[PDB]
Design a protein around this ligand. Sequence first.
Ligand SMILES: CC(=O)N[C@@H]1[C@@H](O)[C@H](O)[C@@H](CO)O[C@H]1O
Length: 330
Amino acid sequence: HMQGSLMLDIGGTWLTAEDRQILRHPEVGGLIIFARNIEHPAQVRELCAAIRAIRPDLLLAVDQEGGRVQRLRQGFVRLPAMRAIADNPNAEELAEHCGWLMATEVQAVGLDLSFAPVLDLDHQRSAVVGSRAFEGDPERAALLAGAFIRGMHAAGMAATGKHFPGHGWAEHVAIPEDARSLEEIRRSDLVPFARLAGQLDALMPAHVIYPQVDPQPAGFSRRWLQEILRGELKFDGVIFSDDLSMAGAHVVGDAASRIEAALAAGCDMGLVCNDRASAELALAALQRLKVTPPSRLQRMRGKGYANTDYRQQPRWLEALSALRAAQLID
Ligand SMILES: CC(=O)N[C@@H]1[C@@H](O)[C@H](O)[C@@H](CO)O[C@H]1O
């Protein structure tokens, strides 16, 4: 008897026979979509509606930030990279309009959540963060990200920060490492997570090892999650996990043990993406563990609804005009 949940994905654009069957299990708590699942706004809207007909309580998420990481394209406005938002005097509200406009549009197609914003610091070396972050100096990036979260919450969408405790300095031979003292990490990459700890609804851990703190990745470290995230930072939200079926991950064992290690470390929901066979393995482990969904998991449901006329409300006009006034909307 413990707590935990599973977030998986599908293959095509509509639900297959086994997709409907595997979704009916209560241990499955979420579903995340990628480019292979998206075609049109009216299509992804019906895709969510098809899922709610099966599980009205399921969590539907997607990777929708600004810049190169935007899965919703064919019918959606192209949002600029969050680094481009910083280079403006009115950048605080400019990021606030960006969070509101991103959440309202992805909620208009039936989705609950977007894994945004990135809280990583744009130092020189990490390439996977790059333009996805705001700036390199810490305290300003946390100010701009907090404004981005204000816009998301204004649209009724919960925000999830990525990637705890920091992916900006961690540079396929092994999983990247960040060999810096905890006192040195807290002075740099950790403070954006500290400032926004009480504001964020959820967090995703980085697939990074910090040797002077814990010998494991953050997504499995009881010390990173239970000792300093919940105790020191006083984060009372949802702890997602890294991709437990990550391509090229250096975690020996099957998905059944990867999800058990994450739940024991403090994670509430486990992600298995682009690997169906691993989703059944982790589902089978959660069933034999007899887990129930954590009470925090419902705070992630999007307070918006699938709306065809979301372009009618006034703020959509003011936000759209304010963003292209700074040359951000194409
Ligand atoms: C380091 C990185 O890019 N992390 C991504 C995260 O942004 C995304 O939300 C998640 C689910 O697709 O998968 C992770 O691997």
